[PDB]
């Protein structure tokens with residue numbers, strides 16, 4: 001199953017590399033730049049999983065109530081496949097009624113980019129119906145991996161959502177805040 | 183299947199992003215740094231695909247005849263999923279009979295790390311046998327993707343090989359040299 005393999009890949013090649021040092025990076029950020037931020041960023045990593053697999057090039061553009069505010073201090077890879085590689089993470093502002101309502105580290109789950117591209121490419125042999133099914137199966141698989149993984153205990157949060165195609169009322173901002181507020 | 187999704191993820195999440203600008207970066211390096219080099223590093227990215235899925239932490243240690251030379255001046259991602267990740271690429275010299283026989287930018291295919299880890303974890307439900315099967319499938323699928331891909335025409339070489347299991351009449355540098363020699 002492609003989702004099975006992608007979920008494992010996203011854990012083995014990203015999450016288990018980034019999550020162990022995340023809180024420290026955040027705790028650190030909250031010290032050096034507390035006077036600049038005048039706030040605290042939350043300590044979990046929030047992973048957006050849109051099941052329609054639409055991943056915009058700039059999160060800061062997908063909802064106008066989500067603005068980029070800063071990057072986290074960098075981490076350098078000292079491990080197979082990422083030796084001397086530089087990872088950063090972005091911090092975002094969440095707006096409600098034009099005002100900051102929360103601050104968090106936010107990103108889209110990259111394998112969704114792959115699911116979407118496989119549905120667009122002939123050579124992948126992968127239909128739109130294949131895509132939504134595999135996206136749900138990806139999210140369930142990743143949940144199971146995380147629920148029992150040494151690195152992902154209490155520092156990661158999966159935000160899965162399906163855009164009702166009927167209206168444009170849906171708010172990514174509100175969705176994130178729903179999870180945020182606890 | 184796992185390998186099929188992984189080859190696509192690897193193309194979509196890495197190769198399509200690093201290949202287009204690779205050839206410019208190597209020509210830049212060839213021209214700017216000709217005094218040091220007294221040679222030309224070759225123009226393609228060479229991708230080690232050990233079928234046993236053994237990826238070391240340190241490439242340079244794998245073979246006494248593969249030696250670190252330099253880093254390629256970097257490239258910062260400017261697309262969906264990769265704003266400001268900094269990729270590091272290394273140039274290596276290949277020795278034959280104690281003498282420099284070639285110079286190329288070399289790395290291991292990261293999804294092999296995932297196939298290996300999947301065969302270690304019981305939750306992934308993946309046997310050692312599945313692993314070899316998927317490794318071959320991964321290489322063949324990646325081949326077919328690259329053959330048709332516009333952004334990866336004449337700038338990429340897959341080096342797939344099988345180490346004799348325990349005895350070690352294997353030279354990684356000979357494997358790389360054999361491909362490089364065209």
Ligand SMILES: Cc1ccc2c(=O)c3cccc(CC(=O)O)c3oc2c1C
Nearest residue numbers: 009010013014110111113114191195263
């Ligand atoms: C831009 C992009 C697109 C797709 C993937 C991906 O499918 C994928 C699947 C498994 C693991 C990774 C690694 C990562 O997210 O850094 C992946 O990265 C991708 C990236 C970085």
Ligand SMILES: Cc1ccc2c(=O)c3cccc(CC(=O)O)c3oc2c1C
Nearest residue numbers: 009013081191192195196292293295296
């Ligand atoms: C350390 C490590 C391990 C496994 C993968 C991976 O399976 C994988 C699968 C698809 C795409 C990527 C992205 C990349 O190679 O940068 C992947 O990256 C991995 C990395 C970076």
